[PDB]
Coordinates of C-alpha atoms in Angstrom, one line a residue:
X61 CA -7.1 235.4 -90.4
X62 CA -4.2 234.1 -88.2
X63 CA -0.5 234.6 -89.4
X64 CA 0.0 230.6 -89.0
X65 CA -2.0 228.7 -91.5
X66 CA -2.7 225.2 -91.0
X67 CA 0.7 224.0 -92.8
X68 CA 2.8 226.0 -90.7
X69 CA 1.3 224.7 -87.5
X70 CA 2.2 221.1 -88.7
X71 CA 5.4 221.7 -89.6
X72 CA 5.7 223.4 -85.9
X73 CA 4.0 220.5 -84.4
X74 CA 4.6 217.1 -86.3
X75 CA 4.0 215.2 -83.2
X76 CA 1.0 216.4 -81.6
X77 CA -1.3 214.4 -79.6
X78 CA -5.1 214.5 -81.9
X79 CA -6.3 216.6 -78.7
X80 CA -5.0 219.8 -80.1
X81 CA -5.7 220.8 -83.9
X82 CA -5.4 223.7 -85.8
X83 CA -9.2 224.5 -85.6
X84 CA -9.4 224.6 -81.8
X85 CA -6.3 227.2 -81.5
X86 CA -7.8 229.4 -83.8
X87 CA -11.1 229.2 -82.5
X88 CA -10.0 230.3 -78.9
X89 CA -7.9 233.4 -80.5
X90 CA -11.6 235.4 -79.9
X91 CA -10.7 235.1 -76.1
X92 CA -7.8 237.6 -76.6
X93 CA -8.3 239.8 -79.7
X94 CA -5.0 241.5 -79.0
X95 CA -3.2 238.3 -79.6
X96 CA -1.1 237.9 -82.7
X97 CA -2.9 241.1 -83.8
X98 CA -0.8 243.8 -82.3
X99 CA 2.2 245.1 -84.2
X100 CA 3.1 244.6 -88.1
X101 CA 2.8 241.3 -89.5
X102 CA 6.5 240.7 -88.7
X103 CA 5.7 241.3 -84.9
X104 CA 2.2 239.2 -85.3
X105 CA 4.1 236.3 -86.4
X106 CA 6.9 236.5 -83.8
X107 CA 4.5 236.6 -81.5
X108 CA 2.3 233.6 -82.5
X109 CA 5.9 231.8 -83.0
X110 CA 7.1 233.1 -79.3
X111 CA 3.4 231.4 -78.2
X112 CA 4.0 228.1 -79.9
X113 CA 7.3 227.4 -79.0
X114 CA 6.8 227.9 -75.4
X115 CA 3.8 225.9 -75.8
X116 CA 6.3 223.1 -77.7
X117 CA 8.3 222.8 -74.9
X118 CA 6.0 222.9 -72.4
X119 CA 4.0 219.7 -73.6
X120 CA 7.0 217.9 -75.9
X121 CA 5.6 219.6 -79.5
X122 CA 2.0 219.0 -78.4
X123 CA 2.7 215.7 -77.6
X124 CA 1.2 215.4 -74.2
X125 CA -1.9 216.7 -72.6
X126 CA -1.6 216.1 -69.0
X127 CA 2.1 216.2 -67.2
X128 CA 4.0 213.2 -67.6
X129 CA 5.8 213.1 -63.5
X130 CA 2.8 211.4 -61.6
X131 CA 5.0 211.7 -58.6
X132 CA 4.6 215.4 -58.3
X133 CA 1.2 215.9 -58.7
X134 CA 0.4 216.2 -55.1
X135 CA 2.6 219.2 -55.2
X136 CA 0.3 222.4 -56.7
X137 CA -2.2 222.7 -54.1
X138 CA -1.1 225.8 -52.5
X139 CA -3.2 225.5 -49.2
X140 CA -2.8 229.3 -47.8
X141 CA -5.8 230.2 -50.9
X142 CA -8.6 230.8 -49.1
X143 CA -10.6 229.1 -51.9
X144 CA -8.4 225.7 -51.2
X145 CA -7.9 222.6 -53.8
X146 CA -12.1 221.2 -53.8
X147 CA -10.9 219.2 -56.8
X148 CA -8.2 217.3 -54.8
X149 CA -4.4 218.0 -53.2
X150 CA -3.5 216.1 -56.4
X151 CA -5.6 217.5 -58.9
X152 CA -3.7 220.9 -59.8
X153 CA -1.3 219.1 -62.2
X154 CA -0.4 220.7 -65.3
X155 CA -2.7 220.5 -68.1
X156 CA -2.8 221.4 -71.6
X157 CA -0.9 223.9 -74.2
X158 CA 0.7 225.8 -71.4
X159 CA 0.5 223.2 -68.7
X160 CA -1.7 225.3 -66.6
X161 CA -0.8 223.8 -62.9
X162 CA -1.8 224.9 -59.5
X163 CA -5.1 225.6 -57.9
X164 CA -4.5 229.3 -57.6
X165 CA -4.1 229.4 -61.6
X166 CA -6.8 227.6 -62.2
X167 CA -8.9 229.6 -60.1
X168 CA -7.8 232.5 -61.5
X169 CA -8.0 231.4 -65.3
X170 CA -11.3 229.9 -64.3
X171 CA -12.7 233.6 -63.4
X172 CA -10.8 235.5 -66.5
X173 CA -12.5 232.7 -68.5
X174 CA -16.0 232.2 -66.6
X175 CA -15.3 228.7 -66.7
X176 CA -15.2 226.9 -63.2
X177 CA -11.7 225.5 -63.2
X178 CA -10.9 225.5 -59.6
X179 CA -14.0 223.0 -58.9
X180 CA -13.2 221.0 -62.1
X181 CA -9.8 221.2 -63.3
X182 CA -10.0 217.9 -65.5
X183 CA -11.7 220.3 -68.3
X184 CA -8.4 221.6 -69.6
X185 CA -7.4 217.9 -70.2
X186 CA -11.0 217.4 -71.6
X187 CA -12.0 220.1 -73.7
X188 CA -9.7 221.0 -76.4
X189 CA -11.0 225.1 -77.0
X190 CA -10.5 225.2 -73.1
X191 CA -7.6 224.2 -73.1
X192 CA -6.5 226.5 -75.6
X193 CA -7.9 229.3 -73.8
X194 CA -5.9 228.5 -70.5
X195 CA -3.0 228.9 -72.5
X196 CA -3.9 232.1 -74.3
X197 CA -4.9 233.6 -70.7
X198 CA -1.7 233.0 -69.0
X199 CA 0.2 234.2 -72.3
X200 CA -1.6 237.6 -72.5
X201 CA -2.5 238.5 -68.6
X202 CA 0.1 236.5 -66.2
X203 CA 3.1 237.4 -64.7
X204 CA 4.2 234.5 -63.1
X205 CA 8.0 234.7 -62.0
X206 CA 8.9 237.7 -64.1
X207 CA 7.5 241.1 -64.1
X208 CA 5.0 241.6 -67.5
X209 CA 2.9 239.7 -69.7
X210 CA 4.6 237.2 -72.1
X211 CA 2.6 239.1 -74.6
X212 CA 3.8 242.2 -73.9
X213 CA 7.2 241.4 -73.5
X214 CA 7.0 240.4 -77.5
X215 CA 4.8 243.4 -77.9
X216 CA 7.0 246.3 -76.0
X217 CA 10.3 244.4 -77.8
X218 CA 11.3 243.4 -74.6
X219 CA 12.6 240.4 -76.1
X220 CA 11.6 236.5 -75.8
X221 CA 13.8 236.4 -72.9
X222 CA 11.5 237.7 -71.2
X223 CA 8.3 235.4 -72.0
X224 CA 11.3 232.7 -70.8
X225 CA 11.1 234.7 -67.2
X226 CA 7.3 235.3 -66.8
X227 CA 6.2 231.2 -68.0
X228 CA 9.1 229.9 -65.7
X229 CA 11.8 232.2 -64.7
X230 CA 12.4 231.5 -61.1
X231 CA 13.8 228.4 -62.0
X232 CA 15.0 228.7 -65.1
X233 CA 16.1 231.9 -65.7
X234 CA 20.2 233.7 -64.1
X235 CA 21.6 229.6 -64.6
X236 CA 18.6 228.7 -63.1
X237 CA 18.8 225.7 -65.8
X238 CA 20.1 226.8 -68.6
X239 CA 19.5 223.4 -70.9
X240 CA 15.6 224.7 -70.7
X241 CA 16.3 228.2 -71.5
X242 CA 18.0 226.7 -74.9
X243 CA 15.2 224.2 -75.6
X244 CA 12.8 227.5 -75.8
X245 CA 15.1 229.5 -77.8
X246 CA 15.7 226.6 -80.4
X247 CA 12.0 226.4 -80.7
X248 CA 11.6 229.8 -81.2
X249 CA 14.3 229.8 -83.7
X250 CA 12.7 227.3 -85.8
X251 CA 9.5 228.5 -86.1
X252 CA 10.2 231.9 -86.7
X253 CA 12.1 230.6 -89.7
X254 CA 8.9 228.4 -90.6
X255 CA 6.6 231.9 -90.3
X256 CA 9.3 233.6 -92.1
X257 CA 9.9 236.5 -89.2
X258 CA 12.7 237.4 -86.8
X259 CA 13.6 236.3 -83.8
X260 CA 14.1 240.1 -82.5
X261 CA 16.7 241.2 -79.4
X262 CA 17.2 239.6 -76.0
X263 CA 16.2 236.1 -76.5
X264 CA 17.7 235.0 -73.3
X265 CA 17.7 235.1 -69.5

């Protein structure tokens, strides 16, 4: 049974949009059995607490669903795929938990997830347990601008710096933009004190 009860993830997420609930996390923690599982309890929690405050930031504490900046939607249809955007140029926009963006991660989370993402990318925004699941994927098997898995970066004691790098890195990791950076670490501080677990070593980047 997961190392954040119901309590804890509403004191995490006081603000959250009715669109993501207790219930559909912890259904979707089947997907990746690993998750919050590996390690002692102290590691289990700072990794569920390393999940939900990137998660925090990425959506303003589960406020939103789908990405706020209309403008740049038409900007994560990355045309040199040879599976291209069938859903739309503008359709690749981040969704949900993790804010799952761009055709070629949709694709791929569609395949890891046998769930047809690419052709209907609207589900994350829809379905709750899909959502979820898009952001579970990307935690445990992405790489993104840094160079392991958010999951094992907590898991090897890399440090939560390095989740930082591998969920946005390139731009906001060496200055990058270091105000963003902060905003993960205070979330991270915060609800590792409401799990009652460490932060652990090399929270930055």
């Amino acid at each position: 049974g997961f190392v954040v009860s119901e309590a804890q993830f509403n004191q995490m997420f006081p603000n959250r949009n009715a669109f993501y609930t207790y219930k559909g996390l912890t259904d979707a923690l089947s997907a990746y059995p690993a998750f919050a599982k590996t390690g002692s309890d102290e590691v289990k929690k700072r990794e569920a607490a390393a999940f939900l405050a990137n998660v925090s930031h990425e959506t303003g504490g589960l406020f939103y669903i789908k990405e706020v900046n209309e403008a740049n939607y038409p900007h994560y249809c990355d045309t040199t795929q040879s599976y291209g955007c069938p859903a739309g140029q503008a359709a690749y926009y981040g969704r949900g938990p993790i804010q799952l963006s761009w055709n070629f991660n949709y694709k791929a989370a569609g395949d890891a997830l046998g769930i047809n993402l690419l052709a209907n990318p609207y589900l994350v925004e829809q379905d709750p347990a899909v959502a979820w699941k898009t952001g579970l994927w990307y935690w445990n098997s992405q790489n993104g601008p840094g160079t392991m898995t958010p999951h094992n970066a907590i898991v090897n004691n890399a440090g939560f710096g390095e989740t930082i790098r591998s969920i946005n890195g390139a731009l906001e990791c060496n200055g990058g933009n270091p105000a963003q950076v902060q905003s993960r670490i205070n979330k991270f501080t915060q609800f590792t004190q409401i799990l009652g677990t460490t932060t652990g070593p090399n929270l930055s980047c």
